[PDB]
Design a binder for these strands. Structure first.
Ligand SMILES: [Zn+2]
Ligand SMILES: [Zn+2]
Lengths: 195, 930, 72, 195
RNA sequence: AAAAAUCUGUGAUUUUAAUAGCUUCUUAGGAGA
RNA sequence: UCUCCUAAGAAGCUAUUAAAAUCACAGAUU
């Protein structure tokens, strides 16, 4: 409250008025000068109040600017972090593209364009197969080799819903997977692999 | 009876016959027609009186007579028409013409004998499959049985199978219909041959469906007028336009498929890298629809306006059932990043629209910014291209890849029990034997497989054609409803986001929520949106389960569309969305408030102006799953019709291919696997409610046009509608460019009677009952018929209602019953919920924190605001549902005040400063403002 | 009396889920079937039997020490 | 209570003003002193706008903060003891349901017969019980049939802790196992099935 | 790991408008030294 | 030549009420 310079002038006016109103009592009331002192003190108080109000109103601008600059700094920091994370993700997912297969897939394309749906069908080497019922396992698995479309696949593992692993049972003709028991929780997620 | 007449009719066919009439007299039968002359117009069903019919019989190997379907029809006419038809048959003798025979049996009787015609013509089949009602279904059963479309048929088969007509409950249905494909294919090919023959011989006339005997042979030539040889004008504008939906309901062109697919053994050998089928759709079109008198651009690039776009998309939807499914979706190209090759999109190949190529292409990248990195990451072309193939047999939808982490199962949890309130309610007497408020709306768990078992319901979406003429006129009428709204593009700075702390889809959701991604400088959001008008930006979509109170046991799902979609769709659509939200007294109710005397205003504005009102309603079974693609495209175009100046046509095509590639054909990522969504709206897509509302308006207008066209205009009592009906047929079918002077008149007629009130899926209409009784307006039975072949679902009457007494208000709109109670000395409608829901949302809570009553005091204050109107309810057992909540809020406040004393403080000021446990605060929420 | 069973079943299912029964993909489905049948029914005769069936599983998962307290 | 004194001073000033205006019936002409008293009372009153406002704001803020703290301290305590709370709630609810069926089941469970705790229960048609002592064995089983719940189950095989399998004893009435109780160790594991 | 919208309550900050009051400059009316 | 009261205009400060905007939490509907 006393920081503003006008407070010092207001205090000086207060002191001057207090001293003069007591020093002038020798000549009596002397309303002529008492009114002048009253008016001077009134003007001083009004000016002090106006200056104080103006300064108080102007104060908030500094806080607003500080908040704005702090927010700008935080948003740019977050942008930098996000850009780094996106770059890392892109360069991590781009690291496992075998250029050899990509060099032959686009050789047969109609002017170097191939629909996206047929990239994994011609480039991949593992087919994740899901079987929800014995009525489908009998009609699809066909022993140990699964034939989908035209190619012939093998089997690497068989995992059930619980997360455990089934194992083959050797027989005279060859390995087989035991199905239709009451202790296996469907579906069975089979991980194949190209021949 | 006379035997000489039968003997003469026998002719030289050397076949047995049995009379059906009592003699030379004709026979009366009910047949559908397609008539348009100087007095009538429509697809009505009228009696036939000009022909006598004989039935052929044959001797079976068992010695018993078999009543084969071969019929001899002997039409009788005047000598002038007799000679005219004789001269006409002198030509047009090809194999596609039913064998005629002309003779005069007596001095006064002229006969034109047509030999070995099938009972029902093509028009009967089309009409019966269109206007389907499960109580007058003989015309369809007598066709399905004869042509062996039910392989296991034994006497009284239909008695045991009571739901053979339900598309979504009879798994064999479509396999039952598909055995009719050969008949429609034969009909089309014979129509083309006969058209060529007529052109060669030079006859100008009108051909329609009822001309074509079911075998595929045309059998009457009354109207044809000769002309100069080599110059003829056959017109099939209404032959094809009426059977259009049935060419794709019965899979007519199945023998043309380019691939052979076995669910367990995969595709047989076929061309795998061919995507441009643009040079084969044209050949098929010329082979089948040669006489369609309008152009056809296989690729929707070249379409001139938003009507030709629909016209060509309709054909593409039929012709894209033959292209192998591994050929659609994003294209791709080989580019380099600092010398390291990878994959990036280079166009799009959509089922309904056609091939589009990006206008910008690059073959190098370095120092990529944030926008380009986001575009690369969000685009599926780089994720699906570097992961293992997937083949799961749980779902019929295509499956293109499986993530590295593998397939994982996710479950749902049960709801908590709030005993602190159940005990209080029981003490108050709410729960007792024989109560009128049984508990419902529980919290239901789900097993491991639900996440994909629910998504499997997309098998209900199948590629359906529309008859373009009726659909286009209905679109022109529907667009009249949205003529009083603002529309355009807005810059980035003017966009408004309701809530910013929500997921940004996959893969962006890993790093942060939408708040982080909305910090991009506006100069980058604007660049992204502008570059969306010259490119196609496909994106991934998640499928995450929902967890909320529900009476139905089935699970739920919502699609988390990625940020690259919303960030631009907002800029595109927000202006018209906010103009729809800020309008009052319009058919679309979105944005109107239920409180403060809003419900009464809506209801008394719906009812005003309609004579003899009788409300009603309807429900779409599985709207999200079974919505046809063409209607979604039509809704998007109806919302995008307002960009007269801000965008060119080409940009309005690229924007539509972006919406189609981001919503209508998402690359769904559900449970550790990447599938391909067949079609239908996604719930979480931007502007879902408004698209649903537009689709609802389209359906409601079609349900009226179809019913108004199919009445005998010769017998309409009113002389004003008797001409509107006649003009409607000509304006719909026999013209190419719509006439606004008539669209406005028909919309005025459709708004004077059959008022409307629509909010997304819900709806209510009060239609002039006197007209609806005469078939001039779509009553409840007029919606099932249209939904049968425009949505592929059966709308059971158990899901619809009718309230002739208006004073009782709608039975149920927006899941809130309506009641009439005097307020301020006048009668005003009030809503009120189902009390079981209010009572069972306080007992069960979805989190452990909410079980602590004191901490969530606001829940009951917000619940008692909506359950107040139950005080006026007559049933004495419903007022407790509100007074108990009031007493419970009082108890909570008292308990909190007493318990807080343990901290050495008094809350008396706020305690006694609470008006919430009194009836005055809530009673003022249903009163019109001063 | 029906509401008592319909409200006890939810808390019983919550307890079973907290006891980590979701690990088994067979027992969980059977328990969910029983719980849904109890919730969606009206006749207390079937609800009581299904609740007893659900409760039979509680002892198998965890032999609660509190088994001897309910008796008194 | 620090705000009440301001109210007391305001009331005192108002009372003094009332007294002076009532006594000063001549103030109608000499309104200078009456106006001075009115202004003094007004100045005394004006203190409220500051004091009551600040007191109310501070009290509201403190009450909000303390109530939030109490709510957090209550919800955390509620969450701290979740499983035991669930057990207590379940038993309190079961006590409410008056059904001799559940009482019989719980009495039998306390007796010593309970599922084997392994080979988890998966179907409505199979069980595996343990019968500790001959007393409960005689109480529960009757020849071939046993009644664990209210329902009656059929026995399939009986096993002893050592792994030796038991067989029925021929009798005119039917198969029986009771005599074997006193000659073989305990407990017995019985594989049941729905009747 | 939890989507696009609309509506309605409660709490916190800012502005505006009105009411009451305080301080001050000016003008005008009543009279006083 | 100055002083008290009264009316208005204007400047500043206090509070009370009402509306609008921004932020946070909570319910309902599609
Ligand atoms: Zn076109
Ligand atoms: Zn635009």
């Amino acid at each position: 409250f006393s920081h503003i310079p006008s407070y010092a002038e207001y205090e000086r006016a207060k002191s001057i008025y207090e001293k003069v109103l007591a020093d002038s009592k020798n000549g009596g009331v002397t309303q002529q000068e008492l009114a002048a002192y009253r008016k001077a003190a009134n003007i001083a108080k009004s000016v002090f109040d106006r200056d104080l109000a103006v300064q108080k109103k102007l104060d908030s601008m500094a806080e607003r600017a500080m908040t704005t600059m702090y927010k700008e700094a935080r948003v740019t920091d977050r942008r930098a972090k996000l850009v780094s994370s996106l770059h890392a993700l892109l360069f991590s997912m781009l690291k496992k593209i075998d250029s050899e297969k990509l060099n032959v897939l686009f050789d047969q394309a109609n002017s170097g364009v191939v629909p996206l749906a047929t990239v994994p069908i011609v480039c991949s080497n593992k087919l994740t197969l899901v079987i929800p019922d014995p009525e489908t396992w009998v009609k699809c698995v066909e022993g140990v080799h699964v034939t989908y479309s035209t190619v012939v696949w093998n089997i690497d593992c068989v995992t059930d819903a619980d997360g455990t692993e089934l194992h083959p049972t050797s027989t005279g003709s060859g390995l087989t997977y035991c199905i239709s028991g009451d202790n296996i929780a469907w579906p069975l997620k089979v991980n194949l692999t190209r021949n | 009876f006379d035997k000489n007449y039968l003997n003469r009719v026998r002719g030289s066919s050397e076949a047995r016959l049995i009379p059906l009439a009592n003699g030379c007299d004709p026979d009366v039968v009910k047949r559908a027609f397609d008539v348009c002359n100087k007095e009538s117009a429509g697809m009505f069903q009228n009696l036939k009186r000009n022909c006598a019919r004989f039935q052929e019989v044959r001797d079976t190997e068992d010695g018993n007579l078999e009543y084969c379907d071969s019929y001899f029809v002997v039409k009788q006419t005047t000598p002038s028409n007799y000679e005219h038809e004789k001269a006409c048959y002198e030509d047009l003798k090809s194999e596609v013409t039913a064998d005629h025979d002309f003779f005069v049996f007596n001095k006064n009787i002229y006969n034109i004998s047509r030999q070995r015609l099938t009972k029902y013509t093509m028009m009967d089949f089309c009409y019966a499959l269109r206007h389907f009602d499960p109580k007058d279904c003989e015309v369809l059963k007598e066709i399905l049985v004869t042509y062996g479309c039910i392989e296991d048929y034994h006497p009284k088969w239909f008695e045991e199978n009571k739901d053979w007509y339900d598309p979504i409950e009879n798994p064999k249905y479509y396999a039952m219909l598909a055995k009719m494909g050969p008949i429609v294919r034969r009909a089309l090919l014979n129509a083309i041959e006969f058209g060529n023959l007529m052109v060669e011989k030079g006859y100008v006339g009108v051909i329609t469906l009822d001309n074509q005997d079911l075998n595929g042979k045309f059998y009457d030539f009354g109207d044809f007028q000769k002309t100069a040889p080599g110059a003829g004008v056959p017109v099939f504008d209404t032959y094809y336009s009426y059977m259009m939906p049935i060419i794709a309901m019965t899979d007519a062109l199945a023998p043309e498929r380019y691939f052979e697919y076995d669910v367990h053994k995969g595709y047989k050998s076929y061309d795998l890298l061919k995507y441009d089928y643009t040079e084969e759709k044209q050949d098929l079109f010329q082979k089948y629809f040669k006489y369609w008198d309008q152009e056809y651009h296989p690729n929707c690039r070249d379409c001139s306006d938003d009507r030709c776009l629909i016209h060509c998309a309709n054909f593409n939807i039929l012709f894209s059932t033959l292209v192998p499914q591994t050929s659609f979706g994003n294209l791709c190209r080989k580019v380099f990043v600092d010398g390291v090759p990878f994959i990036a999109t280079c166009g799009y190949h959509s089922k309904e629209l056609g091939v589009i190529m990006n206008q910008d292409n690059t073959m190098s990248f370095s120092k990529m910014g944030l926008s380009q990195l986001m575009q690369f990451v969000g685009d599926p072309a780089l994720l699906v291209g570097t992961s293992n193939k997937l083949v799961d047999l749980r779902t019929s939808c295509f499956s293109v890849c499986a993530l590295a982490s593998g397939i994982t199962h996710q479950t749902v949890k049960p709801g908590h029990f709030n005993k602190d309130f159940y005990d209080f309610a029981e003490k108050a007497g709410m729960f007792k034997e024989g109560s009128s408020i049984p508990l419902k709306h529980f919290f239901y768990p789900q097993t491991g497989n639900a996440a994909i078992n629910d998504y499997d319901y997309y098998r209900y979406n199948r590629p359906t054609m529309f008859d373009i003429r009726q659909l286009l006129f209905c679109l022109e009428v529907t667009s009249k409803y949205f003529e009083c709204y603002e529309g355009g593009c807005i810059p980035a700075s003017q966009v408004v986001v309701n809530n910013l702390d929500k997921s940004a889809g996959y893969p962006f959701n890993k790093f942060g929520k939408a708040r982080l991604y909305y910090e991009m400088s506006l100069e980058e959001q604007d660049q992204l949106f502008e570059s969306t008008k010259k490119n196609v930006l496909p994106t991934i979509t998640q499928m995450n389960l929902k967890y909320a109170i529900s009476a139905k046991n089935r699970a739920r799902t919502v699609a988390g569309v990625s940020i690259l979609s919303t960030m631009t769709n907002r800029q595109f659509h927000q202006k018209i969305l906010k103009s729809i939200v800020n309008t009052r007294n319009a058919p679309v109710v979105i944005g109107t408030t239920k409180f403060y005397g809003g419900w009464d205003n809506m209801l008394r504005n719906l009812i005003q102006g309609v004579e003899d009102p009788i409300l009603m309603g309807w429900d779409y079974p599985k709207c999200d799953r079974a919505m046809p693609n063409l209607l979604r495209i039509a809704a998007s175009l109806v919302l995008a019709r307002k960009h007269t100046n801000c965008c060119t046509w080409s940009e309005r095509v690229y924007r539509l291919y972006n919406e189609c590639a981001q919503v209508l054909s998402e690359t769904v990522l559900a449970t550790g696997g990447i599938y391909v969504k067949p079609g239908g709206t996604s719930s979480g897509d931007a502007t879902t409610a408004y698209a649903n509302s537009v689709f609802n308006i389209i359906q409601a207008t079609s349900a009226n046009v179809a019913r108004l066209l199919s009445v005998i205009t010769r017998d309409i009592v009113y002389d004003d509608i008797k001409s509107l009906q006649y003009e409607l047929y000509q304006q719909v079918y026999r013209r190419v460019n719509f006439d606004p002077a008539f669209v406005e008149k028909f919309y005025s007629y459709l708004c004077k009677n059959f008022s409307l009130m629509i909010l997304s899926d819900d709806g209510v209409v009060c239609y002039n009952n006197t007209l609806a009784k005469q078939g001039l307006v779509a009553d409840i039975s007029g919606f099932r018929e249209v939904l049968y072949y425009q949505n592929n679902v059966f709308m059971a009457d158990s899901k619809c209602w009718v309230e002739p007494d208006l004073e009782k208000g709608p039975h149920e709109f927006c899941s809130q019953h309506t009641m009439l109670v005097e307020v301020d000395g006048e009668p005003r409608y009030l809503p009120y919920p189902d009390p079981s829901r209010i009572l069972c949302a306080c007992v069960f809570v979805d989190d452990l924190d909410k079980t602590e009553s004191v901490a969530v005091m606001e829940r009951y204050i917000a619940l008692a605001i909506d359950a107040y109107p139950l005080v006026h309810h007559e049933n004495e057992e419903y007022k407790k549902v509100f007074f108990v909540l009031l007493s419970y809020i009082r108890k909570l406040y008292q308990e909190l005040s007493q318990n807080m004393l343990m901290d050495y403080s008094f809350v008396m000021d706020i305690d006694k400063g609470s008006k919430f446990w009194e009836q005055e605060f809530y009673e003022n929420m249903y009163r019109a403002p001063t | 009396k029906l509401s008592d069973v319909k409200c006890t079943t939810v808390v019983l299912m919550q307890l079973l889920t907290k006891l980590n029964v979701e690990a088994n993909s067979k027992m969980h489905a059977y328990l969910v079937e029983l719980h849904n049948k109890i919730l969606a029914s009206d006749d207390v005769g079937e609800c009581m039997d299904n609740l007893l069936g659900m409760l039979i599983t509680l002892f198998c998962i965890d032999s609660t020490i509190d088994l001897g307290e309910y008796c008194d």
